[PDB]
Symmetry: C2
Subunit: 48 residues, 2 copies
């Protein structure tokens, strides 16, 4: 990825990543994080 400016452009960062075997387990943890973090905030929103 790079920081694009008005008619000049320069390098920001890069990762030589290495993928993994579990598309599902990854997506599960992402969804579970959201649904938990959602729910805790609606509890706080009631209390406040």
């Amino acid at each position: 990825f790079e920081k694009n400016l008005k008619d000049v452009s320069f390098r920001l960062g890069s990762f030589n990543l290495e993928k993994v075997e579990n598309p599902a387990e990854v997506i599960r943890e992402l969804i579970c994080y959201c649904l938990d973090t959602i729910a805790e905030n609606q509890a706080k929103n009631e209390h406040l």
Copy 2:
């Protein structure tokens, strides 16, 4: 699906599902809505 009491399960209903042809895509939509629903209730929390 079923409800359990009197130490046994009791069917409440049934569905014909169909396996979905575009799996990763409806998953995309779902995690977008969840990331929104975090951010929305988080914004309400800060205000409260």
